[PDB]
Motif scaffolding. Structure first.
Motif, PDB file in Angstrom:
ATOM      1  N   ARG A   1       0.796  -1.253  -0.094  1.00  0.00           N
ATOM      2  CA  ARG A   1       0.073  -0.051   0.011  1.00  0.00           C
ATOM      3  C   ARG A   1       0.655   1.290   0.001  1.00  0.00           C
ATOM      4  NH1 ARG A   1      -5.822  -0.631   0.579  1.00  0.00           N
ATOM      5  NH2 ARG A   1      -6.777   1.345   1.563  1.00  0.00           N
ATOM      6  N   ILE A   2       1.980   1.404   0.941  1.00  0.00           N
ATOM      7  CA  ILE A   2       2.547   2.580   0.826  1.00  0.00           C
ATOM      8  C   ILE A   2       4.241   2.091   0.918  1.00  0.00           C
ATOM      9  CG2 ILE A   2       3.505   4.479   2.727  1.00  0.00           C
ATOM     10  CD1 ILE A   2       0.895   5.037   1.480  1.00  0.00           C
ATOM     11  N   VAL A   3       5.046   2.811   0.200  1.00  0.00           N
ATOM     12  CA  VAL A   3       6.433   2.226   0.271  1.00  0.00           C
ATOM     13  C   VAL A   3       7.281   3.658   0.518  1.00  0.00           C
ATOM     14  CG1 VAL A   3       8.495   1.449  -1.231  1.00  0.00           C
ATOM     15  CG2 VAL A   3       6.049   0.415  -1.506  1.00  0.00           C
TER      16      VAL A   3
END
Ligand SMILES: [Mg+2]
Ligand SMILES: [Mg+2]
Ligand SMILES: [Mg+2]
Ligand SMILES: [Mg+2]
Ligand SMILES: [Mg+2]
Ligand SMILES: [Mg+2]
Ligand SMILES: [Mg+2]
Ligand SMILES: [Mg+2]
Ligand SMILES: [Mg+2]
Length: 101
Positions: A8-10
């Motif tokens: 989802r988030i990096v």
RNA sequence: AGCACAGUCUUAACGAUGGAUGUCUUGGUUCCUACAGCGAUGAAGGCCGCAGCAAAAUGCGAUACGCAAUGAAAAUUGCAGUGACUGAAUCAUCAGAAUGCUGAAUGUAAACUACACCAAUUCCCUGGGAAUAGUGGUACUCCUACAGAAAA
């Protein structure tokens, strides 16, 4: 278990958590701290509020080559922690104090 | 060296107290013209922090009174400092990067910096070499697929 097509988030930036710098600020040089050096074999440091006892032990060891066997802690009213660090017998507090100031 | 009784009241001249009057205005007020929402990719609001010496307001966010880039273009100052012979000292623009704890607040709680379960996690060289108890996920309702199990 989750098998996402992609996270989802990096994040990709440098770490934002406190390292050895910013976890210890500077030694305290008041007249009560200078007395602990000779007859007690102790040094006093000012630290970030979010530091643990184990954190301070490890950071002091990595920064100044200090072996310790006891840490005591107190939160002051200016937003800082105070640490009383007992040096082990092999170390002399005077030589460590001279090595840094 | 000498001479006016004292008190009370009246009038001039010079002063004390107080802040009217006149002049001023980087502020209000009304009308006209144009454009128009923000938020789970985490809003409005709240708290906590940041400067060499730093209380408030203003500005910022662990890169913290400011970074990078673009346009101008020598100064900026209380002291100490920092700068060219123009990506540098300062102003403007602002598209890159970064953006603490919270809050609909959404793992469980809350006059607690209290307590869970799952995956150990993050770097550097080009398969090695390192570091770190540190990081992420887990509310409820609903739609489209899918998965097996159950009744019939
Ligand atoms: Mg205690
Ligand atoms: Mg008389
Ligand atoms: Mg709307
Ligand atoms: Mg805040
Ligand atoms: Mg250039
Ligand atoms: Mg320029
Ligand atoms: Mg919660
Ligand atoms: Mg309680
Ligand atoms: Mg409901």
């Amino acid at each position: 278990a989750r098998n996402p097509k992609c996270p989802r988030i990096v994040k990709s930036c440098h770490s934002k958590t406190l390292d050895k710098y910013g976890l210890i600020k500077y030694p305290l040089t008041s007249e009560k701290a200078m007395k602990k050096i000779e007859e007690i074999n102790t040094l006093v440091f000012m630290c970030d509020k979010r530091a643990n006892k184990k954190n301070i032990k490890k950071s002091v060891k990595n920064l100044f080559g200090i072996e310790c066997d006891k840490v005591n802690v107190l939160n002051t009213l200016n937003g800082d922690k105070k640490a009383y660090v007992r040096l082990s017998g092999e170390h002399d507090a005077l030589e460590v104090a001279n090595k840094i100031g």
